[PDB]
Amino acid sequence: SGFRKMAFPSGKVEGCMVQVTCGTTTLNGLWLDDVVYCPRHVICTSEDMLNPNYEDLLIRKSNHNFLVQAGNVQLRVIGHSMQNCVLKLKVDTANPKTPKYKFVRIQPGQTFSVLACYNGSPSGVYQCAMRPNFTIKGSFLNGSCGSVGFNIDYDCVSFCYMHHMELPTGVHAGTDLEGNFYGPFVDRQTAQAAGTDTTITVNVLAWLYAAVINGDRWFLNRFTTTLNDFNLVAMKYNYEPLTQDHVDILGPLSAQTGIAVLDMCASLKELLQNGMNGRTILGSALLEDEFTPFDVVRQCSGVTFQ
Amino acid sequence: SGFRKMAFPSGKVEGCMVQVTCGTTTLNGLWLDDVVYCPRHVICTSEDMLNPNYEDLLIRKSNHNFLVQAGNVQLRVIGHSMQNCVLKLKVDTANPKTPKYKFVRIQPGQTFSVLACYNGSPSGVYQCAMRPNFTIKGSFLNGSCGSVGFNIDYDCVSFCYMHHMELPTGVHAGTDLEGNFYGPFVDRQTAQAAGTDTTITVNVLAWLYAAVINGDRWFLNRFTTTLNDFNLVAMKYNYEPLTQDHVDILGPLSAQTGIAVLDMCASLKELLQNGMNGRTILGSALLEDEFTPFDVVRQCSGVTFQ
Ligand SMILES: *[C@H](O)[C@H](C[C@@H]1CCNC1=O)NC(=O)[C@H](CC1CC1)NC(=O)[C@@H](NC(=O)OCc1ccccc1)C1CC1
Ligand SMILES: *[C@H](O)[C@H](C[C@@H]1CCNC1=O)NC(=O)[C@H](CC1CC1)NC(=O)[C@@H](NC(=O)OCc1ccccc1)C1CC1
Domain A15-99 class? Predict the structure, then answer.
């Protein structure tokens, strides 16, 4: 019993983190096989931030401009290319700690662990989610760029996120490992806005099931509802529409608890309508939307990895 | 910026987790040098669980009764002994991935990362605190016993917690690595209760400082108070007393924000007397007490470890 915001164990990712320095810019890189991936804005200067032609700046550069510390063993760069917003540094040493891995591009609503790093060294690990407006609510300081987000499926690390930038609401934006931003953002210090976020309804329902599995039942009711009538209330409260696809992912959790999905929808509806009136659910006084249905099953069945 | 419950990177601990089986009991062990530490109730049967004399049971045992598996590698047990509520299994192979480590016993209100494990394999990592009633609010299922809690000290793992039991309430209880329970609990399935908990006042205050450092100031005020009159209010709302030592640990955060500790205390008092009135702080609608002052500084200055 118990339910926590739980990250994947970070060991397999820690053994890939390196430091990349070019000019007076230091950030993090990801070293897989003989390749080091990092944000291309490592090749900028502090005045270049306003409107760089990264294509300008890369041909400017020679392999020897790139300093690639793995620990205090310095890695010789022997080639470089740019893929969208990531820079790929070919080095003369394959990473012996390379895990088995994939590059995946995730969908809004999905979650992943972030291993926050500075100067190639890990600082901490936390979950978060790709928000519907394609930002993430992370914890990043100067120097964190190149930190990555990932999921583990038994032995395989699926990398989904590399950090690039903080927007002026304190939320963060970045790319997949092929260098394409999530959302409309660009690696440029000109005014950009996140866009209004919304709540991940299917995740909120999964968390309500986590609650029931762990003994919070004070929010349930006999009420039932239809997908469409529930969806009328979702609009009103800035909640993502629920699809039949979503209902179907929630089946397993529905069956384990014996609570129909639309009955849980009726519970959520009364929760938005009436608020919580002092009570908490799983230690929270807000409805939590950063656990997927898989995160809930993962944790409430103790799935492991190696 | 941003603020999350961030765990320590778990790599150094993952390389010490092993599986310990004896009879029909499998749980986790911690393998450091040539010693495997695990809960002594691995030697019990599903009927010993009631009121065992572990001395009874351990004399009954032979080295070959313990199956200790490090991945798929059979570790041979060559010696055993019991220290309070932990078993120490002497094995013929020293763990080549043993880190710099210490065994520490923490105080209530201190935090640590937990690496939850099943069958010797990591399942996830999360942060929590030693509650004032010496329980932890964890996430643990059957088979998780022997999972450990730890802090990192640049390069040194300080182990503080090993998991043993879940109380009714769904909170958890365990030992330090020398086998002494936190709190008055015992490793037998006789009726036991946690004891009323209280809020870690010093931790709520540094979390309010984390909020200010990150741009939530809606709760701040003109007012100040005396440590004596604040503590009159902390009593009324089931908060731990604030000591002058606590005021002193909050100095650094106080100086960075320029808000006196006693000004922040006046702010918390109005929060307690009025509530939050629909507003959130750092994404929470409750006052959060599982960040220490050190947790806030490391995160809001990006301390790294190796
Ligand atoms: C990389 O280490 C770093 C991480 C940032 C720094 C602080 N928190 C983080 O997550 N990223 C950057 O410094 C990038 C570099 C730019 C991408 C090439 N910049 C930013 O994160 C800046 N944000 C920004 O310019 O947003 C656009 C904007 C929005 C409003 C008004 C003007 C511009 C943050 C320093 C501001
Ligand atoms: C070890 O893997 C396991 C972990 C537990 C099981 C589920 N959640 C967990 O964290 N620990 C146990 O099974 C231990 C074994 C006891 C230490 C020798 N027991 C418990 O966790 C049980 N709790 C318990 O006996 O508490 C005392 C009590 C309280 C009320 C009434 C009677 C007894 C939980 C299985 C019940």
Answer: mainly beta
- The three-state DSSP-derived secondary structure of B194-250 is CCCCCECHHHHHHHHHHHHHCCCCCCCCCCCCCHHHHHHHHHHCCECCCCHHHHHHC
Structure resolution in Å?
A: 1.9
> Which two three-digit tokens encode residue B1?
């910026």
Quote the DSSP letter at residue B16: T
- By what technique were these coordinates determined? X-ray
Give me A131's structure tokens.
Answer: 């928000």
The Cα A32–Cα A95 span in angstroms is 6
Count contacts between A and B (CB, < 8 Å). 164
And the tokens for A66? 């790139």
Q: Which of A44, A117, A145, A265 is catalytic?
A: A145
Nearest chain B Cα distance for residue A59, angstroms? 33
Query: Which of B170, B301, B302 is opposite residue A214, by nearest beta carbon?
Result: B170
CATH of domain B198-301: 1.10.1840.10
Ligand 1 neighbourhood includes A168 CB (under 6 angstroms) = yes
Length of chain B: 306
Q: What sign does the CA torsion over A301, B19, B193, A280 have? A: negative
What's the rounded Cα separation, in Å, for the pair A271 and A234?
Answer: 12
The structural domains of chain A, with segments of one domain joined by +, span 1-14+100-197, 15-99, 198-301
B42, two tokens: 């691995």
- Classify domain B1-14+100-197 by CATH number: 2.40.10.10
Q: Which of B165, B152, B162, B139 is nearest to B37 (CA)?
A: B162
User: Comparing C-alpha atoms, which of B262, B258, B257 is closest to residue B246?
Assistant: B262
Q: Which atom of ligand 2 is nearest to the CA of B144?
A: 2
* CATH topology identical between A15-99 and A198-301: no
Contact (Cβ atoms closer than 8 angstroms) between residue A288 and residue A206: no
